[PDB]
Amino acid sequence: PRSLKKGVFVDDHLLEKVLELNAKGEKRLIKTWSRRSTIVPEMVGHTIAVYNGKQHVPVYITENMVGHKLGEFAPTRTYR
Amino acid sequence: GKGDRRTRRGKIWRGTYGKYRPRK
Amino acid sequence: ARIAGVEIPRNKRVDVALTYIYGIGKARAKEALEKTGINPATRVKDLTEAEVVRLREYVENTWKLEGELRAEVAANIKRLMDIGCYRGLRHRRGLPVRGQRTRTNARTRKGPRKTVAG
Amino acid sequence: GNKIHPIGFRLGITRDWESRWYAGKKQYRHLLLEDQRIRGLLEKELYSAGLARVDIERAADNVAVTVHVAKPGVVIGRGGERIRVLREELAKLTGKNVALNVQEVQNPNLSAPLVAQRVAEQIERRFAVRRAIKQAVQRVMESGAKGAKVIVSGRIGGAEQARTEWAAQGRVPLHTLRANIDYGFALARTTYGVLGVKAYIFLGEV
Amino acid sequence: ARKALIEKAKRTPKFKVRAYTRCVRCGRARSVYRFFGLCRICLRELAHKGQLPGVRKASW
Amino acid sequence: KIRIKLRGFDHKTLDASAQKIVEAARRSGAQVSGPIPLPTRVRRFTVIRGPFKHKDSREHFELRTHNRLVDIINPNRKTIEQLMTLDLPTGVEIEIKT
Amino acid sequence: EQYYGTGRRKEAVARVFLRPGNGKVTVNGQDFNEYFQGLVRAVAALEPLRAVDALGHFDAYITVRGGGKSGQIDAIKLGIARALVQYNPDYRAKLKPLGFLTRDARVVERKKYGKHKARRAPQYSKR
Amino acid sequence: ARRRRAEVRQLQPDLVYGDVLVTAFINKIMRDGKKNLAARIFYDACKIIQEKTGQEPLKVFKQAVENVKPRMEVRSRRVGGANYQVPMEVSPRRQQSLALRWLVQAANQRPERRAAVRIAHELMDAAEGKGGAVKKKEDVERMAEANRAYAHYRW
RNA sequence: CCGGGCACUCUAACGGGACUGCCCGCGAAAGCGGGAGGAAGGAGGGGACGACGUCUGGUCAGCAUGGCCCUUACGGCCUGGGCGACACACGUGCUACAAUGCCCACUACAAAGCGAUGCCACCCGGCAACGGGGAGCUAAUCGCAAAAAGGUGGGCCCAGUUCGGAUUGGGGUCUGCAACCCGACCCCAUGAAGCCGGAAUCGCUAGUAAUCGCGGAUCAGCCAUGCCGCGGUGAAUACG
Ligand SMILES: [Mg+2]
Ligand SMILES: [Mg+2]
Ligand SMILES: [Mg+2]
Ligand SMILES: [Mg+2]
Ligand SMILES: [Mg+2]
Ligand SMILES: [Mg+2]
Ligand SMILES: [Mg+2]
Ligand SMILES: [Mg+2]
Ligand SMILES: [Mg+2]
Ligand SMILES: [Mg+2]
Ligand SMILES: [Mg+2]
Ligand SMILES: [Mg+2]
Ligand SMILES: [Mg+2]
Ligand SMILES: [Mg+2]
Ligand SMILES: [Mg+2]
Ligand SMILES: [Mg+2]
Ligand SMILES: [Mg+2]
Ligand SMILES: [Mg+2]
Ligand SMILES: [Mg+2]
Ligand SMILES: [Mg+2]
Ligand SMILES: [Mg+2]
Ligand SMILES: [Mg+2]
Ligand SMILES: [Mg+2]
Ligand SMILES: [Mg+2]
Ligand SMILES: [Mg+2]
Ligand SMILES: [Mg+2]
Ligand SMILES: [Mg+2]
Ligand SMILES: [Mg+2]
Ligand SMILES: [Mg+2]
Ligand SMILES: [Mg+2]
Ligand SMILES: [Mg+2]
Ligand SMILES: [Mg+2]
Ligand SMILES: [Mg+2]
Ligand SMILES: [Mg+2]
Ligand SMILES: [Mg+2]
Ligand SMILES: [Mg+2]
Ligand SMILES: [Mg+2]
Ligand SMILES: [Zn+2]
């Protein structure tokens, strides 16, 4: 039960950046402070470092995780 | 009773509408 | 009265007795009785071989059911588990997923209480 | 921890609002803000002029700001000069084209807020508070005023520990709302601390 | 409360959702009545003063 | 049809203004239906007494907007001769819809 | 001709008109037994006429409104009482000793703050 | 009751019989403030009890409630250490209340499915001299005549 | 609905009305017991109101304020995150463990409030949340609106169930710049514990307890089962 209902929202920040990164070949680590945006298909293959609120953690983006968000793989919490 | 959201009493307790409690 | 992948209700009302199938609740039972053209208030014993065979025709292949449904749900768990998703982590640690509080009353998902000292 | 504000009790019977007009959903908020701005301005400037009550009334874009003064000479000013500046500064904040009105209050010792201001003044220059208290209650009692009461706050005379002062006279029944009990609060800001001054004055029956 | 935190008054909040009441007199952070523009403490004191017309002592 | 919507925070003020209007209009006009009273809009506000709890101490106040209706029938000139602007009350509020 | 009694019970109003007739009582376009169908206390509404031996001597038409149907029944009782008194005042001698002319002033009591419903206090545990 | 005698509430008479004990029993059957449903329970039970045995439910009700009323009971009194069970007689009002309470509690502790059936059969058994309510009554009375050794602690 | 009319219910402003006044009793008096009359009585019921002071009670984290520390810095903007963490422990509650019950149609009766892009009758689409269209109400006239328990009818048949809805998988609407952290809601499916609760402990003396729904403030939305009000039905018991 998760819903965006139309024009699935992806922030311009990484949108234009990655759609221009794809044109020159795959790039290495990217900078991401916007975990509010949705993952889109052409993101597969990169390595995206997202913000925990404190840290910068790299995430390998694959075909399986397209429908979800950036931040499902950056755990804010730390326990045990 | 009131917690069952797919029955009519659970619909009137939440005040919502649907298939198990149509409006009219 | 065998209908789906092995499923034998008996001695009750048919629409009620269909809830005992895995992928059928009251809604799908009413839908089966609706489109199959069968009296819902009938007992299971009085079900015609033709009525039973039509219920089998509909219920068997319109929705995914017992073994397929259990394996599909479990494989969905495994699917969002093998990915590094946070939801998969909540399924790993055995904690509620829908976004509840875990300070108190996480009993259903976390199991019986294991009381450490303090 | 008891004894709610007396004028808030009194608002219904034997007391009236400092603002009496009408509004709705879309108007009440900033109109009340404008009233607060008016009272703010008049408490900035007219404190030493001996003012007690500001009654603001509105019919329809008509404002009727009424200032009750113990000394109208400082409000009117020589040749009316001072009823020009701050009466224009009043309209330089609100574009409602508002006019100003003055009124006389007899016996400045009979109005409780004025007595509070007086005792707070004598406290700020650090007089013995109890003499100011009893003298104020006598000023009240020497002209009608079947009851009078004065309360002062802690750190009296600059003392480290906080205390509570006293010396009412007559009869001051805050419990029963019958007989037009007036109340005034003042704030004495001094080097040692802050002293609240409560002046209760009881006059009339019905 | 804090002066800068009344930044709502210049609203321009970059997003329409970020508008909160911020009781005018006391600069209330949490609990504000929208009809008076004041907060429960400021409303209490102002209704005690007698500057809010029509406000009486409720009793029944 | 001359509807006169009277509204206020004070009931005696409404009675004063409405009765003055009807007394003015009674010297010229018809068997005027006169001062009908309408239900009052009651806005209640519960406030916790002390800042920083003592939750169960709250007291409430109530504002009430009173409404009255006039409904003058067949007024011509002398009615509005005593109508233009002659009233004292300030807290009263008058509307006219036709 | 016709006699009138109003009565009132627990936020209910039951205008009662009594005339001579056979004993047929109607309410709001329904007979007395169709509108109050299956209510065990519905017989108490025509109880005030059993000290005067009506229902064969009388006939009624009632219009009731407000509250619940039990308050409607009791307001019907009181209204029948006052109509019976205005018909024949001597009936008072047999009415008030029965108690049918007394307005039941029991009203639901307002809810107070700090409580759940107007008297129930919230439960504390370990004082 | 520190000051006053706590004057007893005078219940309204009944619409069917005209008797007050019937209204009291119907109140004892009522729960959550449903006197209508409780009255329907008692009167369907009245029909059932008048049919299954060809007697008037009036006198059977009266005889049952009379059979369940006890004549002695026990109250605890603190004397010289831990308290003791002291027997004593019963007030008529308290006999009425206890009889009706035992009636309802023994009726609902019965196996019968419907409420009115439980009420009717409980009233029948109590009117015959047997049943659960009379068993609780006779246990209350068996508390007396047993600790009668404390008959000098009456108070 | 209309013509029309205020008698009625009603709405809301002023009044009348209860005072132990009448009688019996007891008493030195207040007063007490009983009775009539009365809508009502011995304070008719409910509020608002909380004394001199107490506990160095509570908050300078609402405000105002006396002193001591901060100054490319505690001040200041913004993004992200947090206040939602969990092997545990209590407090307050919500829903329940069913047959005086559940569900399904059908039908009747409240009071108090709220609504100018705000409440949204009505038609259409959709199983639905909801969307499109669109009338009216500056609201005793319009709308929220259906009250719910109840009534008759029906099915269930003592069974972890046509009890109970937690958990979880999927699909979807909506407010919003944006629902991973972390929203509500709808639909399909999954249908957990729980079959009246150990020691102990809580509320309530009359429309009260119990139960049933309704509304409101704050608020774009809402984790509100909270809080503050409203009425429906309506007890048990008080020897002491
Ligand atoms: Mg740990
Ligand atoms: Mg269910
Ligand atoms: Mg002053
Ligand atoms: Mg001094
Ligand atoms: Mg007074
Ligand atoms: Mg400050
Ligand atoms: Mg906000
Ligand atoms: Mg807010
Ligand atoms: Mg609270
Ligand atoms: Mg009430
Ligand atoms: Mg209630
Ligand atoms: Mg507490
Ligand atoms: Mg007409
Ligand atoms: Mg007349
Ligand atoms: Mg007497
Ligand atoms: Mg008497
Ligand atoms: Mg009497
Ligand atoms: Mg009283
Ligand atoms: Mg009183
Ligand atoms: Mg009273
Ligand atoms: Mg008093
Ligand atoms: Mg203190
Ligand atoms: Mg402390
Ligand atoms: Mg300061
Ligand atoms: Mg918290
Ligand atoms: Mg409608
Ligand atoms: Mg009108
Ligand atoms: Mg109308
Ligand atoms: Mg109108
Ligand atoms: Mg049935
Ligand atoms: Mg089990
Ligand atoms: Mg089940
Ligand atoms: Mg069972
Ligand atoms: Mg009491
Ligand atoms: Mg809301
Ligand atoms: Mg939540
Ligand atoms: Mg609610
Ligand atoms: Zn404030």
Side-chain angles (χ1 to χ4, degrees), chain A, chain B, chain C, chain D, chain E, chain F residues 1-97, chain G, chain H:
Chain A
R2 53 172 89 187
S3 57
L4 331 168
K5 332 148 296 185
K6 47 189 57 63
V8 158
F9 192 86
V10 184
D11 303 16
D12 316 87
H13 318 331
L14 32 61
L15 190 58
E16 67 174 317
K17 173 176 286 186
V18 79
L19 68 85
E20 283 178 320
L21 277 180
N22 298 332
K24 286 77 195 172
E26 300 288 347
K27 197 210 180 180
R28 278 67 197 174
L29 311 174
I30 210 60
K31 49 189 61 179
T32 309
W33 289 269
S34 62
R35 65 200 311 185
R36 304 274 179 173
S37 47
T38 317
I39 300 181
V40 282
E42 60 273 357
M43 290 182 173
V44 177
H46 294 262
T47 307
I48 290 184
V50 205
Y51 210 62
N52 299 342
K54 169 204 179 304
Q55 251 234 54
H56 265 322
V57 281
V59 180
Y60 191 13
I61 166 76
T62 333
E63 160 75 65
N64 38 72
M65 57 183 69
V66 164
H68 313 285
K69 314 279 188 176
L70 333 116
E72 307 260 32
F73 313 85
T76 286
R77 267 51 181 264
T78 342
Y79 161 70
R80 177 185 159 277
Chain B
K2 299 155 189 166
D4 188 318
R5 28 183 301 173
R6 70 170 67 194
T7 51
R8 198 147 212 177
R9 269 185 190 173
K11 233 64 174 181
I12 70 179
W13 177 83
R14 279 192 180 183
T16 66
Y17 295 101
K19 195 192 71 176
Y20 299 94
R21 185 205 173 187
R23 307 197 176 188
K24 210 90 274 177
Chain C
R2 172 169 286 99
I3 291 294
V6 263
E7 271 296 336
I8 297 89
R10 195 66 173 186
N11 214 120
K12 259 138 156 51
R13 266 165 126 262
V14 176
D15 52 332
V16 149
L18 293 185
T19 302
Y20 296 164
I21 314 184
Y22 189 65
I24 287 90
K26 292 303 298 173
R28 285 186 172 176
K30 208 165 189 176
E31 158 144 353
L33 271 298
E34 167 70 35
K35 305 223 175 186
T36 324
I38 305 181
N39 179 24
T42 44
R43 258 59 241 271
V44 170
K45 54 173 183 176
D46 301 323
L47 259 252
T48 311
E49 109 91 348
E51 283 177 309
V52 155
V53 88
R54 288 203 315 257
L55 252 191
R56 190 181 308 117
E57 300 325 287
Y58 200 3
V59 176
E60 266 267 62
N61 47 319
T62 179
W63 325 293
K64 25 235 175 181
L65 286 194
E66 195 123 356
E68 275 172 327
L69 231 193
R70 293 173 190 273
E72 175 161 329
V73 171
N76 243 2
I77 308 284
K78 306 276 187 174
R79 158 244 186 181
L80 45 69
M81 252 179 170
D82 289 352
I83 72 177
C85 182
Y86 158 88
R87 203 159 158 186
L89 283 181
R90 309 309 286 182
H91 280 272
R92 287 175 182 177
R93 307 180 192 179
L95 296 180
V97 161
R98 301 307 191 187
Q100 302 91 336
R101 69 150 63 184
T102 78
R103 195 175 191 179
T104 34
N105 295 334
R107 270 19 270 181
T108 280
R109 191 102 216 281
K110 209 193 300 180
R113 280 162 183 261
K114 21 191 152 52
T115 304
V116 203
Chain D
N2 31 73
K3 273 183 254 60
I4 48 92
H5 194 270
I7 305 182
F9 197 152
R10 268 127 260 278
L11 275 188
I13 316 297
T14 71
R15 193 73 179 187
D16 266 304
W17 283 265
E18 315 214 18
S19 300
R20 37 200 175 194
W21 35 262
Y22 175 85
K25 322 281 185 177
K26 302 180 178 181
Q27 318 175 29
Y28 197 96
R29 317 164 294 266
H30 7 75
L31 279 173
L32 210 64
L33 223 191
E34 191 174 74
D35 282 273
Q36 197 65 25
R37 300 289 171 80
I38 291 182
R39 292 193 182 86
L41 193 162
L42 298 187
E43 293 183 56
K44 315 293 181 176
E45 279 275 30
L46 284 68
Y47 150 76
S48 58
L51 131 148
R53 217 187 192 191
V54 178
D55 297 71
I56 306 179
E57 315 133 26
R58 303 171 184 266
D61 203 5
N62 283 12
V63 199
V65 183
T66 294
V67 172
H68 295 99
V69 206
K71 296 121 58 181
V74 199
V75 166
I76 296 294
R78 46 101 192 180
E81 163 59 34
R82 212 187 186 187
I83 205 176
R84 185 60 151 180
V85 176
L86 300 180
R87 189 169 178 168
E88 181 180 1
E89 219 299 290
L90 145 144
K92 288 302 179 179
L93 222 183
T94 111
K96 301 288 258 57
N97 248 270
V98 25
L100 192 146
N101 268 272
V102 197
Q103 251 237 357
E104 160 194 351
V105 166
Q106 308 85 350
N107 202 165
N109 304 137
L110 236 287
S111 181
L114 297 178
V115 181
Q117 298 168 28
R118 171 79 175 191
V119 181
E121 280 191 345
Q122 286 172 324
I123 285 167
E124 290 154 10
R125 302 186 185 183
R126 280 157 290 100
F127 283 77
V129 71
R130 257 143 303 194
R131 204 167 313 163
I133 293 158
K134 298 187 306 176
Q135 284 176 352
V137 183
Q138 288 291 351
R139 303 155 200 162
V140 180
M141 210 72 189
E142 283 166 340
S143 52
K146 303 176 296 182
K149 174 184 276 288
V150 172
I151 280 87
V152 197
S153 109
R155 296 208 68 174
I156 281 160
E160 180 176 22
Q161 273 276 43
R163 297 203 292 100
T164 294
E165 233 25 68
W166 253 111
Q169 292 174 34
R171 40 167 289 99
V172 195
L174 323 177
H175 249 252
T176 163
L177 201 208
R178 155 178 293 285
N180 186 25
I181 294 185
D182 189 56
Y183 164 82
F185 181 76
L187 208 286
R189 38 176 57 182
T190 335
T191 311
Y192 35 87
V194 142
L195 267 146
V197 177
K198 301 184 172 183
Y200 304 81
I201 298 187
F202 161 76
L203 54 135
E205 188 74 27
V206 190
Chain E
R2 304 222 294 278
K3 273 189 171 183
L5 273 293
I6 318 192
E7 63 192 5
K8 145 264 176 301
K10 30 158 172 172
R11 0 200 85 207
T12 321
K14 184 193 174 189
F15 300 113
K16 52 171 282 189
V17 273
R18 298 167 153 175
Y20 39 100
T21 339
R22 268 294 181 182
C23 131
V24 38
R25 181 201 169 192
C26 113
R28 194 56 191 273
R30 196 69 103 183
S31 178
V32 185
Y33 283 22
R34 311 151 76 252
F35 167 63
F36 297 107
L38 295 164
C39 84
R40 71 169 214 275
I41 323 177
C42 293
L43 162 62
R44 175 164 166 82
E45 295 143 345
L46 257 287
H48 283 342
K49 243 78 174 187
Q51 312 176 207
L52 326 184
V55 176
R56 300 195 71 261
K57 282 287 300 181
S59 180
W60 71 100
Chain F
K1 271 118 293 182
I2 298 92
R3 269 178 174 173
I4 304 96
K5 202 97 172 61
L6 311 164
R7 38 193 57 258
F9 288 170
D10 188 11
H11 63 273
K12 293 187 63 179
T13 296
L14 292 214
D15 284 3
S17 190
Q19 190 196 349
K20 289 180 181 62
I21 288 184
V22 177
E23 284 178 2
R26 272 194 179 277
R27 322 200 177 192
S28 58
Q31 189 217 323
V32 182
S33 303
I36 125 143
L38 288 184
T40 294
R41 288 296 183 180
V42 185
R43 315 254 228 87
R44 203 180 325 279
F45 313 101
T46 284
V47 160
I48 307 98
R49 279 188 197 268
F52 196 94
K53 54 109 239 86
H54 307 327
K55 50 174 186 182
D56 295 308
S57 60
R58 16 189 183 270
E59 81 170 325
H60 34 27
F61 317 102
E62 59 168 62
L63 184 148
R64 50 177 62 260
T65 296
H66 309 254
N67 304 278
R68 298 290 197 262
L69 230 46
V70 184
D71 250 56
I72 313 173
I73 315 180
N74 297 83
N76 320 95
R77 180 48 49 238
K78 290 84 157 56
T79 298
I80 331 185
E81 163 80 351
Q82 308 140 313
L83 238 301
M84 302 310 298
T85 304
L86 294 171
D87 73 318
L88 307 181
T90 326
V92 77
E93 226 250 348
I94 302 180
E95 305 281 64
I96 295 93
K97 183 166 185 175
Chain G
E1 163 64 10
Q2 164 213 41
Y3 298 88
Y4 178 33
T6 300
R8 258 173 298 274
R9 173 66 212 275
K10 233 251 223 68
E11 210 183 75
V13 249
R15 325 178 193 185
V16 172
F17 310 141
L18 276 170
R19 306 173 194 88
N22 186 267
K24 47 187 183 306
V25 187
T26 183
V27 175
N28 305 330
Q30 298 189 27
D31 185 71
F32 181 80
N33 303 280
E34 178 179 295
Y35 182 48
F36 292 156
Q37 215 290 78
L39 300 191
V40 207
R41 294 219 312 105
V43 110
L46 44 118
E47 190 80 38
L49 310 116
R50 294 172 185 176
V52 315
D53 299 323
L55 217 180
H57 301 23
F58 260 78
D59 203 310
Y61 159 63
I62 303 175
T63 161
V64 71
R65 196 169 307 108
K69 294 193 175 184
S70 174
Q72 294 181 1
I73 292 176
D74 291 315
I76 285 175
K77 165 190 297 182
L78 222 205
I80 290 184
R82 9 204 61 178
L84 231 44
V85 170
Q86 193 174 90
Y87 175 92
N88 195 337
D90 266 63
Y91 279 155
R92 286 229 202 181
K94 288 291 185 179
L95 245 80
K96 290 195 175 183
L98 243 309
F100 280 79
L101 261 179
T102 292
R103 207 289 205 191
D104 181 289
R106 299 193 297 175
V107 198
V108 129
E109 173 178 338
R110 96 165 190 90
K111 192 263 182 181
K112 295 82 171 287
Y113 50 93
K115 306 293 183 177
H116 285 278
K117 9 159 298 306
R119 287 204 186 186
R120 158 151 200 87
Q123 159 196 164
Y124 67 93
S125 61
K126 270 83 200 67
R127 183 189 301 192
Chain H
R2 259 206 211 273
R3 282 190 176 274
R4 213 192 186 188
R5 202 55 157 269
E7 25 67 83
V8 192
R9 298 197 184 277
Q10 230 56 41
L11 300 83
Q12 286 274 354
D14 183 81
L15 300 323
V16 177
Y17 290 13
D19 186 287
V20 295
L21 181 54
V22 161
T23 304
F25 194 68
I26 261 173
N27 295 349
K28 277 294 182 177
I29 309 174
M30 147 175 50
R31 49 177 65 127
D32 286 335
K34 288 184 178 181
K35 194 146 61 68
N36 181 92
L37 167 62
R40 284 209 285 99
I41 290 178
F42 172 75
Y43 288 123
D44 288 59
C46 248
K47 307 182 199 307
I48 293 177
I49 195 177
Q50 188 266 346
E51 294 175 51
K52 197 159 296 181
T53 298
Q55 297 168 346
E56 305 177 12
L58 161 80
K59 194 183 169 303
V60 152
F61 181 96
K62 293 296 182 173
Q63 173 77 339
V65 178
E66 136 78 15
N67 287 11
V68 178
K69 290 189 176 186
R71 46 192 186 270
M72 277 185 299
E73 60 169 338
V74 129
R75 302 190 202 175
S76 300
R77 188 194 190 188
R78 255 274 202 173
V79 164
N83 23 330
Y84 301 143
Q85 316 277 284
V86 182
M88 57 189 63
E89 282 180 292
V90 199
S91 160
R93 154 77 172 183
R94 179 168 176 81
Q95 279 181 7
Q96 179 114 314
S97 294
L98 289 171
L100 298 194
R101 186 176 319 144
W102 290 332
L103 275 240
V104 170
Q105 292 186 4
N108 262 314
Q109 277 289 341
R110 253 195 168 275
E112 345 247 312
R113 305 285 178 85
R114 293 124 64 179
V117 186
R118 297 192 293 262
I119 305 298
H121 263 92
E122 186 56 76
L123 284 156
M124 291 221 308
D125 286 8
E128 265 188 337
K130 60 178 183 179
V134 195
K135 223 288 277 74
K136 303 181 181 183
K137 155 223 173 180
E138 292 175 15
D139 294 333
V140 163
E141 298 183 334
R142 272 190 174 186
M143 287 292 291
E145 319 278 70
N147 273 337
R148 232 266 297 171
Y150 303 84
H152 51 283
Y153 284 142
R154 292 293 166 169
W155 188 6

